[PDB]
Write an enzyme that holds these catalytic residues in place. Structure first.
Site, PDB file in Angstrom:
ATOM      1  CB  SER A  90      25.496   0.810 -11.660  1.00  0.00           C
ATOM      2  OG  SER A  90      24.935   0.930 -10.367  1.00  0.00           O
TER       3      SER A  90
ATOM      4  CG  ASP B 106      27.723   5.120  -5.680  1.00  0.00           C
ATOM      5  OD1 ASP B 106      26.529   5.020  -6.024  1.00  0.00           O
ATOM      6  OD2 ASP B 106      28.627   4.321  -6.005  1.00  0.00           O
TER       7      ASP B 106
ATOM      8  CG  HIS C 126      25.295   0.710  -5.729  1.00  0.00           C
ATOM      9  ND1 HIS C 126      25.964   1.606  -6.534  1.00  0.00           N
ATOM     10  CD2 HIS C 126      25.229  -0.449  -6.428  1.00  0.00           C
ATOM     11  CE1 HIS C 126      26.312   1.003  -7.659  1.00  0.00           C
ATOM     12  NE2 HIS C 126      25.879  -0.242  -7.619  1.00  0.00           N
TER      13      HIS C 126
HETATM   14  C1  LIG Z   1      36.305   4.160 -13.653  1.00  0.00           C
HETATM   15  C2  LIG Z   1      34.837   4.135 -14.089  1.00  0.00           C
HETATM   16  C3  LIG Z   1      34.192   5.321 -14.392  1.00  0.00           C
HETATM   17  C4  LIG Z   1      32.867   5.325 -14.782  1.00  0.00           C
HETATM   18  C5  LIG Z   1      32.166   4.137 -14.866  1.00  0.00           C
HETATM   19  C6  LIG Z   1      32.811   2.949 -14.581  1.00  0.00           C
HETATM   20  S1  LIG Z   1      31.867   1.411 -14.716  1.00  0.00           S
HETATM   21  C7  LIG Z   1      31.184   1.145 -13.097  1.00  0.00           C
HETATM   22  C8  LIG Z   1      31.707   1.743 -11.916  1.00  0.00           C
HETATM   23  C9  LIG Z   1      31.088   1.456 -10.705  1.00  0.00           C
HETATM   24  C10 LIG Z   1      29.998   0.599 -10.689  1.00  0.00           C
HETATM   25  N1  LIG Z   1      29.102   0.067  -9.641  1.00  0.00           N
HETATM   26  N2  LIG Z   1      28.164  -0.773 -10.247  1.00  0.00           N
HETATM   27  C11 LIG Z   1      28.440  -0.779 -11.633  1.00  0.00           C
HETATM   28  O1  LIG Z   1      27.860  -1.336 -12.500  1.00  0.00           O
HETATM   29  N3  LIG Z   1      29.567   0.075 -11.864  1.00  0.00           N
HETATM   30  N4  LIG Z   1      30.144   0.334 -13.066  1.00  0.00           N
HETATM   31  C12 LIG Z   1      34.145   2.933 -14.187  1.00  0.00           C
END
Ligand SMILES: Cc1cccc(Sc2ccc3n[nH]c(=O)n3n2)c1
EC number: 3.1.1.98
Length: 344
Positions: free
Chosen positions: A145, A243, A288
Site C-alpha cells: 500500500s 484494487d 487490497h
Molecule cells: C495519490 C497517491 C499515489 C500513490 C500513493 C499514495 S499513498 C496510498 C494510496 C492508497 C492506499 N491504500 N492503502 C494505503 O496505505 N494507501 N496509500 C497516494
C-alpha cells in the site's frame, strides 16, 4: 518472532518525535534480507494529521508499539506459509511518518510533526549493517500500500546508500505490493493531497524521476507507471487489477452500463501500464494488499502463484525460463474472472 529495536539515532523519529524503529528476526544461515515497509495512507496538513494522531496514533508514534510482532505471509519463517523466502532475515519497518515514506523533515519551531520516512529507511539500513546486513547477498525492499509506493520512492536510494557506504556487493531489489496507482478520472466527483503533502513533508522523490518532471511536479513520481521506468534497481510489481483503494479514491463503492465500462476501462488501463514491467503479478480481483497475509500463497495467475513468480524472479537475476514465469498479468476483464481471487 520479530523483536522491536528502536533506532539508536533517536533524532530519526516518528511524527510526534518518538524514535522510529524496526522489528527484526535474524536467520544466521541466510544471506537474504527482507525489509518490509508497512502502509497506512498519509496525512497532508496540520488538521488532517491531528485527526490521525487521535485515532491512528500507532501510525504516528512508537510510544505504544509492542515489543514483538509475528511475521506473516512473506515475513513468515515457516516454509508452508512462505515458500519463497522462509529462511531469510526478516525486518518489518513500522510506518510512523505519514508521508508515503518520502519525508526528510524534523519536528521543530515551525513544524508540529516530523516527516522522516525516507530517513527512517536509511537509518534502519545503516543500523542493520552492524547486525549482519553487511554480509548480505540480496536486500529485498518490500512493502504494501503506502509502503509499496514507498519501495518505488526509496529502492534506488538504498542501493546508492550501500554503494557509498562501501558495500557494492549487496544486490538491492524492490517488491512493491498494492502501491501502483493511476491518476485517473473519478467515477463520480488525491493528486492535490499528495501535492500538498509533499510540500508539508519536505518530501523527496527519486532523482531521475525528479529531473524529468521538475520543480512543483514531483507528485508525478508517486505514480508507479511514471516512476518505475526511471528506476535502476530490479523491482517486482504486485497489483490487483481492481484494487479497492484505487476504487475508493475513484469513488466507486447491480452494476449499470456506465459503471461497468468504468471498471472494465480501469482494468484495461492498469494492465496496459504493466505491459513493459517484466516482473509483475496482477490478478483480476477486487481486493487490497497481498504479501503479508497468511494465505498469500493461494492466488494464481495463469496457474502460477506469487511465491513461485518471486522464486522465478530470483532465478532470472542469477532469456525467459522454461516453466518459471515472472510476468503474470490477467487478461480477463472483470473482478473475480480469475477463480483464485480471495473470497472474503
Ligand atoms: C495519490 C497517491 C499515489 C500513490 C500513493 C499514495 S499513498 C496510498 C494510496 C492508497 C492506499 N491504500 N492503502 C494505503 O496505505 N494507501 N496509500 C497516494
Amino acid at each position: 518472532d520479530l523483536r522491536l529495536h528502536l533506532l539508536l539515532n533517536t533524532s530519526v523519529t516518528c511524527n510526534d518525535g518518538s524514535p522510529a524503529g524496526y522489528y527484526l528476526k535474524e536467520s544466521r544461515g541466510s544471506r537474504r534480507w527482507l525489509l518490509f515497509l508497512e502502509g497506512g495512507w498519509y496525512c497532508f496538513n496540520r488538521e488532517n494529521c491531528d485527526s490521525r494522531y487521535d485515532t491512528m496514533r500507532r501510525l504516528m508514534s512508537s510510544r505504544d508499539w509492542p515489543r514483538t510482532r509475528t511475521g506473516t505471509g512473506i515475513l513468515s519463517s515457516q516454509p508452508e506459509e512462505n515458500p519463497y523466502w522462509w529462511n531469510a532475515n526478516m525486518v518489518f519497518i513500522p510506518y510512523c511518518s505519514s508521508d508515503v515514506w518520502s519525508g526528510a523533515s524534523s519536528k521543530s519551531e515551525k513544524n508540529e510533526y516530523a516527516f522522516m520516512g525516507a530517513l527512517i529507511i536509511q537509518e534502519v539500513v545503516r543500523e542493520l549493517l552492524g547486525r549482519g546486513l553487511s554480509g548480505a547477498k540480496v536486500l529485498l525492499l518490500a512493502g504494501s500500500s503506502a509502503g509499496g509506493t514507498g519501495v518505488l520512492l526509496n529502492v534506488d536510494r538504498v542501493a546508492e546508500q550501500l554503494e557509498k557506504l562501501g558495500y557494492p556487493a549487496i544486490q538491492v531489489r524492490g517488491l512493491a505490493d498494492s502501491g501502483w496507482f493511476l491518476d485517473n478520472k473519478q467515477y463520480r466527483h488525491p493528486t492535490e493531497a499528495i501535492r500538498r503533502g509533499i510540500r508539508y513533508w519536505n518530501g523527496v522523490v527519486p532523482e531521475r524521476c525528479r529531473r524529468q518532471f521538475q520543480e512543483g511536479e514531483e507528485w508525478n513520481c508517486f505514480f508507479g507507471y511514471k516512476v518505475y521506468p526511471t528506476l535502476r534497481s530490479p523491482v517486482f510489481v504486485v497489483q490487483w487489477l481492481f484494487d479497492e483503494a484505487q476504487l475508493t479514491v475513484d469513488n466507486v463503492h447491480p452494476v449499470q452500463e456506465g459503471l461497468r465500462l468504468y471498471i472494465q476501462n480501469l482494468g484495461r488501463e492498469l494492465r496496459h501500464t504493466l505491459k513493459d514491467v517484466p516482473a509483475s503479478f496482477a490478478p483480476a480481483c477486487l481486493s487490497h494488499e497481498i504479501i503479508i497475509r497468511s494465505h498469500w500463497t493461494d492466488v494464481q495467475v495463469k496457474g502460477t502463484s506469487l511465491p513461485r513468480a518471486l522464486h522465478c524472479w530470483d532465478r532470472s537475476l542469477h532469456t525467459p525460463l522454461k516453466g518459471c514465469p515472472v510476468h503474470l498479468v490477467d487478461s480477463c476483464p472483470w473482478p473475480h474472472c480469475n477463480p483464485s481471487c480471495p473470497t472474503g
